């Protein structure tokens, strides 16, 4: 098999001249040359069989990305594993290859403001589709969020994503770890277990910021300094806002805090549209049923060059139920794996 950086990269004879690209969670990423197609393309390894966890992932991505269908969203090419379960020890996920992904562009290049209304347009309608099929994505940050040379965005990684499950969302204080830190809405902290559809709209609102000055909005330096960020910008929380949190531990350790101002958008982005300002605001909204959804956010005025609902597709078959994917083996977990995976060979 062929060898990068001294791992097995056993992805031919059909993909050829690999190279060297970046790491995923489960291994390594790599660009190859598609023999059929005659195109380059990305290619991921993943080694999730050891662990549990590491399959539920896998799975799960596997499952979604095979249903969806979009071109806001980056889909499964081909997947390529050994022809039989006990010679099964990875798996390569084939995918197209990007030129670039919002986190590292963010490094080095101002974005314009006609770049952040498109790439903002990109996200949204990609995002519709996924809440449309009753899918969290519950990862979004700008690495997951790939660009060709054209400027067209493209989302990554299913592998945290859930179904939907709003009368099941409520829990305790300081309980839950969803989402990347940077990204994560301040419900979670206090009282969210993240499986309502406001979860990603805050990760977008965090993403359009720091579209517009090129620095992560809230950057909390671990778990319990995250609140501490979004609440020094959005000020303190109105009773009302208090008073739909019921739980006790999250609503008294709010009024234990003293009365801090709202910072107002335009004074942290003085160069920014009036337009995106609202929008952000709407999207950074701290009650999460205030916070605008995502069919709103499209049809806000400051993506009205791109708005197009008969042009912003949905999902033919929404995911119904959790695919009750905890509680089973890793040798269960396997076993699915390659089954959905057989579509592939040979
Ligand atoms: C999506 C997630 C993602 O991009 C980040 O998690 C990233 O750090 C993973 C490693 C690199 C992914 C990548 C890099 C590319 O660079 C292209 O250079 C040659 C033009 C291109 C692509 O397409 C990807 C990519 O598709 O990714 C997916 C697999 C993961």
Known sequence: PEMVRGQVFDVGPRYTNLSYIGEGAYGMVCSAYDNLNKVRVAIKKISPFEHQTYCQRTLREIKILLRFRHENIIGINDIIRAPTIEQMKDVYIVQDLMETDLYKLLKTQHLSNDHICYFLYQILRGLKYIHSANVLHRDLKPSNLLLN??????????????????????????????????????????????????????????????????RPIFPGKHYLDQLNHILGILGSPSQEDLNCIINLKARNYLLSLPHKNKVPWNRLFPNADSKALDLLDKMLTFNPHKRIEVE??????????????????????????????????????????????????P
């Not at 939907?164 to 277990?193: C, Q």
């Open 296 to 345: 709103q956010a499209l049809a806000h005025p400051y993506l009205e060059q791109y708005y197009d609902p008969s042009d912003e597709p949905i999902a033919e078959a929404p995911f119904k139920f959790d695919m009750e994917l905890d509680d089973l083996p890793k040798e269960k977990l396997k076993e699915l794996i390659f089954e959905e995976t057989a579509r592939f060979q």
């Open 149 to 214: 040379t054209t400027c067209d965005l493209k989302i990554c990684d299913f592998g945290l994503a859930r179904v939907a499950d709003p009368d099941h969302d409520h829990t305790g204080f300081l309980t839950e770890y969803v989402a990347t830190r940077w990204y994560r809405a301040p419900e979670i902290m206090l009282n969210s277990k993240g499986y309502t559809k406001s979860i990603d709209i805050w990760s977008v609102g965090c993403i359009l910021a720091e579209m517009l000055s090129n």
